[PDB]
PDB file of C-alpha atoms and ligand atoms in Angstrom:
ATOM      1  CA  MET A   1       0.000   0.000   0.000  1.00  0.00           C
ATOM      2  CA  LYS A   2       1.121   3.597  -0.485  1.00  0.00           C
ATOM      3  CA  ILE A   3       1.762   5.200   2.900  1.00  0.00           C
ATOM      4  CA  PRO A   4       3.439   8.353   4.301  1.00  0.00           C
ATOM      5  CA  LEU A   5       6.225   6.528   6.159  1.00  0.00           C
ATOM      6  CA  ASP A   6       8.939   4.016   5.271  1.00  0.00           C
ATOM      7  CA  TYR A   7       7.963   0.376   5.529  1.00  0.00           C
ATOM      8  CA  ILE A   8      11.179  -0.445   7.356  1.00  0.00           C
ATOM      9  CA  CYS A   9      10.718   2.373   9.850  1.00  0.00           C
ATOM     10  CA  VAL A  10       7.067   1.437  10.467  1.00  0.00           C
ATOM     11  CA  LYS A  11       7.694  -2.265  10.834  1.00  0.00           C
ATOM     12  CA  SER A  12      11.067  -1.776  12.585  1.00  0.00           C
ATOM     13  CA  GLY A  13       9.740   0.543  15.259  1.00  0.00           C
ATOM     14  CA  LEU A  14      12.923   2.521  14.566  1.00  0.00           C
ATOM     15  CA  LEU A  15      12.413   5.693  12.592  1.00  0.00           C
ATOM     16  CA  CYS A  16      14.740   7.346  10.159  1.00  0.00           C
ATOM     17  CA  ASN A  17      15.137  11.046  10.688  1.00  0.00           C
ATOM     18  CA  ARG A  18      12.693  11.823   7.896  1.00  0.00           C
ATOM     19  CA  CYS A  19       9.847   9.721   9.327  1.00  0.00           C
ATOM     20  CA  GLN A  20      10.587  10.745  12.909  1.00  0.00           C
ATOM     21  CA  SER A  21      10.295  14.389  11.833  1.00  0.00           C
ATOM     22  CA  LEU A  22       6.947  13.661  10.206  1.00  0.00           C
ATOM     23  CA  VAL A  23       5.751  12.272  13.548  1.00  0.00           C
ATOM     24  CA  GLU A  24       7.120  15.248  15.472  1.00  0.00           C
ATOM     25  CA  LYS A  25       5.568  17.666  12.915  1.00  0.00           C
ATOM     26  CA  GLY A  26       2.282  15.832  13.566  1.00  0.00           C
ATOM     27  CA  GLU A  27       1.711  14.939   9.920  1.00  0.00           C
ATOM     28  CA  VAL A  28       1.720  11.279  10.920  1.00  0.00           C
ATOM     29  CA  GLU A  29       0.073  11.269  14.326  1.00  0.00           C
ATOM     30  CA  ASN A  30       1.061   8.584  16.733  1.00  0.00           C
ATOM     31  CA  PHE A  31      -2.084   6.507  16.323  1.00  0.00           C
ATOM     32  CA  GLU A  32      -1.550   6.780  12.575  1.00  0.00           C
ATOM     33  CA  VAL A  33       1.770   5.014  12.970  1.00  0.00           C
ATOM     34  CA  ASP A  34       0.110   2.127  14.746  1.00  0.00           C
ATOM     35  CA  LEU A  35      -2.416   1.817  11.903  1.00  0.00           C
ATOM     36  CA  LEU A  36       0.407   1.722   9.411  1.00  0.00           C
ATOM     37  CA  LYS A  37       1.974  -1.211  11.315  1.00  0.00           C
ATOM     38  CA  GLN A  38      -1.297  -3.129  11.400  1.00  0.00           C
ATOM     39  CA  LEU A  39      -2.085  -2.202   7.817  1.00  0.00           C
ATOM     40  CA  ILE A  40       1.282  -3.419   6.429  1.00  0.00           C
ATOM     41  CA  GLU A  41       1.031  -6.494   8.669  1.00  0.00           C
ATOM     42  CA  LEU A  42      -2.458  -7.122   7.371  1.00  0.00           C
ATOM     43  CA  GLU A  43      -1.426  -6.912   3.718  1.00  0.00           C
ATOM     44  CA  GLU A  44       1.611  -9.166   3.929  1.00  0.00           C
ATOM     45  CA  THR A  45      -0.447 -11.735   5.843  1.00  0.00           C
ATOM     46  CA  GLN A  46      -3.981 -11.446   4.539  1.00  0.00           C
ATOM     47  CA  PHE A  47      -4.683  -8.963   1.699  1.00  0.00           C
ATOM     48  CA  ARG A  48      -2.287  -8.822  -1.232  1.00  0.00           C
ATOM     49  CA  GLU A  49      -4.949  -6.482  -2.690  1.00  0.00           C
ATOM     50  CA  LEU A  50      -4.085  -3.843  -0.088  1.00  0.00           C
ATOM     51  CA  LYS A  51      -0.834  -3.037  -1.894  1.00  0.00           C
ATOM     52  CA  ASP A  52      -2.855  -1.195  -4.534  1.00  0.00           C
ATOM     53  CA  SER A  53      -4.468   1.185  -2.037  1.00  0.00           C
ATOM     54  CA  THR A  54      -3.281   4.519  -0.688  1.00  0.00           C
ATOM     55  CA  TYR A  55      -3.221   5.722   2.928  1.00  0.00           C
ATOM     56  CA  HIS A  56      -4.466   9.283   3.656  1.00  0.00           C
ATOM     57  CA  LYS A  57      -4.376  11.483   6.746  1.00  0.00           C
ATOM     58  CA  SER A  58      -6.605   9.786   9.258  1.00  0.00           C
ATOM     59  CA  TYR A  59      -8.483  11.075  12.255  1.00  0.00           C
ATOM     60  CA  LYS A  60      -9.246   9.594  15.659  1.00  0.00           C
ATOM     61  CA  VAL A  61     -12.104  10.820  17.794  1.00  0.00           C
ATOM     62  CA  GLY A  62     -12.817   9.254  21.151  1.00  0.00           C
ATOM     63  CA  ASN A  63     -13.037   5.496  20.820  1.00  0.00           C
ATOM     64  CA  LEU A  64     -13.242   5.713  17.058  1.00  0.00           C
ATOM     65  CA  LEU A  65     -10.640   5.523  14.343  1.00  0.00           C
ATOM     66  CA  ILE A  66     -11.560   6.966  10.966  1.00  0.00           C
ATOM     67  CA  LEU A  67      -9.256   5.772   8.236  1.00  0.00           C
ATOM     68  CA  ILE A  68      -9.250   7.669   4.946  1.00  0.00           C
ATOM     69  CA  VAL A  69      -8.030   5.644   1.947  1.00  0.00           C
ATOM     70  CA  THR A  70      -8.064   5.388  -1.826  1.00  0.00           C
ATOM     71  CA  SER A  71      -9.069   1.877  -2.813  1.00  0.00           C
ATOM     72  CA  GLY A  72      -6.975   0.237  -5.464  1.00  0.00           C
ATOM     73  CA  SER A  73      -8.561  -1.682  -8.308  1.00  0.00           C
ATOM     74  CA  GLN A  74      -7.957  -4.810  -6.227  1.00  0.00           C
ATOM     75  CA  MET A  75      -9.874  -3.779  -3.118  1.00  0.00           C
ATOM     76  CA  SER A  76     -13.449  -4.974  -2.718  1.00  0.00           C
ATOM     77  CA  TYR A  77     -15.722  -2.820  -0.590  1.00  0.00           C
ATOM     78  CA  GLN A  78     -16.389  -6.093   1.249  1.00  0.00           C
ATOM     79  CA  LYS A  79     -12.647  -6.569   1.819  1.00  0.00           C
ATOM     80  CA  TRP A  80     -12.528  -3.086   3.391  1.00  0.00           C
ATOM     81  CA  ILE A  81     -15.149  -4.157   5.926  1.00  0.00           C
ATOM     82  CA  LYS A  82     -12.943  -7.188   6.418  1.00  0.00           C
ATOM     83  CA  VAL A  83      -9.913  -4.918   6.827  1.00  0.00           C
ATOM     84  CA  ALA A  84     -11.827  -2.776   9.315  1.00  0.00           C
ATOM     85  CA  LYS A  85     -12.645  -5.727  11.579  1.00  0.00           C
ATOM     86  CA  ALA A  86      -9.027  -6.885  11.380  1.00  0.00           C
ATOM     87  CA  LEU A  87      -7.804  -3.483  12.575  1.00  0.00           C
ATOM     88  CA  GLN A  88     -10.535  -3.388  15.217  1.00  0.00           C
ATOM     89  CA  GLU A  89      -9.144  -6.587  16.749  1.00  0.00           C
ATOM     90  CA  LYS A  90      -5.437  -5.726  16.739  1.00  0.00           C
ATOM     91  CA  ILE A  91      -6.106  -2.193  17.982  1.00  0.00           C
ATOM     92  CA  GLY A  92      -8.673  -1.696  20.715  1.00  0.00           C
ATOM     93  CA  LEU A  93     -10.655   1.092  19.072  1.00  0.00           C
ATOM     94  CA  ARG A  94     -13.554   0.853  16.658  1.00  0.00           C
ATOM     95  CA  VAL A  95     -12.490   1.261  13.049  1.00  0.00           C
ATOM     96  CA  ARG A  96     -14.330   2.865  10.141  1.00  0.00           C
ATOM     97  CA  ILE A  97     -12.837   2.886   6.668  1.00  0.00           C
ATOM     98  CA  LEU A  98     -14.067   5.863   4.641  1.00  0.00           C
ATOM     99  CA  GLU A  99     -12.840   6.280   1.103  1.00  0.00           C
ATOM    100  CA  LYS A 100     -11.323   9.681   0.520  1.00  0.00           C
ATOM    101  CA  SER A 101     -13.798  12.058  -0.992  1.00  0.00           C
ATOM    102  CA  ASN A 102     -13.882  15.697  -1.771  1.00  0.00           C
ATOM    103  CA  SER A 103     -17.595  16.363  -1.122  1.00  0.00           C
ATOM    104  CA  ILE A 104     -18.781  16.300   2.423  1.00  0.00           C
ATOM    105  CA  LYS A 105     -22.013  14.619   1.378  1.00  0.00           C
ATOM    106  CA  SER A 106     -20.071  11.531   0.267  1.00  0.00           C
ATOM    107  CA  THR A 107     -18.102  11.056   3.453  1.00  0.00           C
ATOM    108  CA  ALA A 108     -21.176  11.718   5.564  1.00  0.00           C
ATOM    109  CA  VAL A 109     -23.077   8.919   3.878  1.00  0.00           C
ATOM    110  CA  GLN A 110     -20.240   6.472   4.447  1.00  0.00           C
ATOM    111  CA  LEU A 111     -19.653   7.236   8.105  1.00  0.00           C
ATOM    112  CA  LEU A 112     -23.266   7.477   9.297  1.00  0.00           C
ATOM    113  CA  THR A 113     -23.992   4.043   7.673  1.00  0.00           C
ATOM    114  CA  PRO A 114     -25.827   1.785   8.837  1.00  0.00           C
ATOM    115  CA  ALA A 115     -28.126   4.771   9.320  1.00  0.00           C
ATOM    116  CA  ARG A 116     -29.442   6.517   6.214  1.00  0.00           C
ATOM    117  CA  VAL A 117     -29.098  10.238   5.694  1.00  0.00           C
ATOM    118  CA  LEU A 118     -32.003  12.508   4.694  1.00  0.00           C
ATOM    119  CA  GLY A 119     -30.056  15.297   3.006  1.00  0.00           C
ATOM    120  CA  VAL A 120     -27.119  17.659   3.315  1.00  0.00           C
ATOM    121  CA  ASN A 121     -27.334  21.457   3.363  1.00  0.00           C
ATOM    122  CA  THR A 122     -24.451  23.704   2.514  1.00  0.00           C
ATOM    123  CA  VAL A 123     -24.727  27.236   3.887  1.00  0.00           C
ATOM    124  CA  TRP A 124     -22.503  30.264   3.337  1.00  0.00           C
ATOM    125  CA  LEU A 125     -22.085  32.818   6.058  1.00  0.00           C
ATOM    126  CA  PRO A 126     -21.775  36.527   5.315  1.00  0.00           C
ATOM    127  CA  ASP A 127     -18.193  35.896   6.543  1.00  0.00           C
ATOM    128  CA  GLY A 128     -17.954  33.561   3.533  1.00  0.00           C
ATOM    129  CA  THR A 129     -17.179  30.581   5.759  1.00  0.00           C
ATOM    130  CA  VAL A 130     -19.066  27.438   4.648  1.00  0.00           C
ATOM    131  CA  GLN A 131     -20.972  25.259   7.116  1.00  0.00           C
ATOM    132  CA  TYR A 132     -22.628  21.919   6.555  1.00  0.00           C
ATOM    133  CA  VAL A 133     -25.711  20.238   8.069  1.00  0.00           C
ATOM    134  CA  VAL A 134     -26.472  16.508   7.663  1.00  0.00           C
ATOM    135  CA  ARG A 135     -30.153  15.817   8.091  1.00  0.00           C
ATOM    136  CA  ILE A 136     -31.228  12.424   9.435  1.00  0.00           C
ATOM    137  CA  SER A 137     -34.701  11.038  10.075  1.00  0.00           C
ATOM    138  CA  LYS A 138     -35.628  10.722  13.735  1.00  0.00           C
ATOM    139  CA  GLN A 139     -35.938   6.963  13.166  1.00  0.00           C
ATOM    140  CA  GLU A 140     -32.390   6.657  11.806  1.00  0.00           C
ATOM    141  CA  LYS A 141     -30.884   8.310  14.900  1.00  0.00           C
ATOM    142  CA  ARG A 142     -31.133   4.859  16.540  1.00  0.00           C
ATOM    143  CA  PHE A 143     -28.987   3.422  13.737  1.00  0.00           C
ATOM    144  CA  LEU A 144     -26.116   5.884  14.002  1.00  0.00           C
ATOM    145  CA  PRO A 145     -22.779   4.071  14.488  1.00  0.00           C
ATOM    146  CA  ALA A 146     -21.656   6.444  17.263  1.00  0.00           C
ATOM    147  CA  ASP A 147     -23.213   9.249  19.261  1.00  0.00           C
ATOM    148  CA  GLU A 148     -24.188  12.212  17.104  1.00  0.00           C
ATOM    149  CA  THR A 149     -21.688  14.688  18.555  1.00  0.00           C
ATOM    150  CA  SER A 150     -18.726  12.386  17.855  1.00  0.00           C
ATOM    151  CA  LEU A 151     -19.828  11.989  14.230  1.00  0.00           C
ATOM    152  CA  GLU A 152     -19.969  15.790  14.073  1.00  0.00           C
ATOM    153  CA  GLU A 153     -16.403  16.142  15.317  1.00  0.00           C
ATOM    154  CA  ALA A 154     -15.285  13.391  12.945  1.00  0.00           C
ATOM    155  CA  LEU A 155     -16.858  14.898   9.859  1.00  0.00           C
ATOM    156  CA  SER A 156     -15.648  18.349  10.882  1.00  0.00           C
ATOM    157  CA  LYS A 157     -12.053  17.135  11.139  1.00  0.00           C
ATOM    158  CA  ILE A 158     -11.981  15.269   7.819  1.00  0.00           C
ATOM    159  CA  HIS A 159     -13.207  18.210   5.755  1.00  0.00           C
ATOM    160  CA  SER A 160     -11.730  20.807   8.131  1.00  0.00           C
ATOM    161  CA  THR A 161     -15.030  22.668   8.321  1.00  0.00           C
ATOM    162  CA  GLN A 162     -18.095  22.944  10.547  1.00  0.00           C
ATOM    163  CA  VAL A 163     -20.395  19.927  10.307  1.00  0.00           C
ATOM    164  CA  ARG A 164     -23.566  19.454  12.356  1.00  0.00           C
ATOM    165  CA  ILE A 165     -26.263  16.777  12.570  1.00  0.00           C
ATOM    166  CA  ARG A 166     -29.958  17.759  12.631  1.00  0.00           C
ATOM    167  CA  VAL A 167     -32.058  14.866  13.906  1.00  0.00           C
ATOM    168  CA  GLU A 168     -35.343  16.446  12.647  1.00  0.00           C
TER     169      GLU A 168
HETATM  170 ZN1  LIG B   1      11.925   6.408   7.394  1.00  0.00          ZN
END
């Protein structure tokens, strides 16, 4: 798989100066480094298809890991759910693979699944700052994969903007 650190460094535990700086800089957070270990482990052992994918900056919020990726032409959406459960056993936290997307409506549909989303509103302040609102049926709120405020923080981090959930 394509990643932001050296395979040797990640698997070694011993970082070259270049990788170590990335971790100090914060570009590869510490929990991201653990993912990279378990990811490379999980492709040598279990998923040759992983080597076609691409790692992307990933976020952690509370008990939840959100992994952003680009799936290679080898990676079944099923296999990603398989990869998620693999990660969720090696690491303690819950794992959610989201494929990297540039619209906020795409990544909100993926995360909030199994719940279904009603719609997404963009809004532009007089400031010009853009905010987003993901509408969900009251029924669906019971199907959210994590409490609504953690999903809000998650979505807000990924797209570096304000994201809010309206249970209407
Ligand atoms: Zn290195």
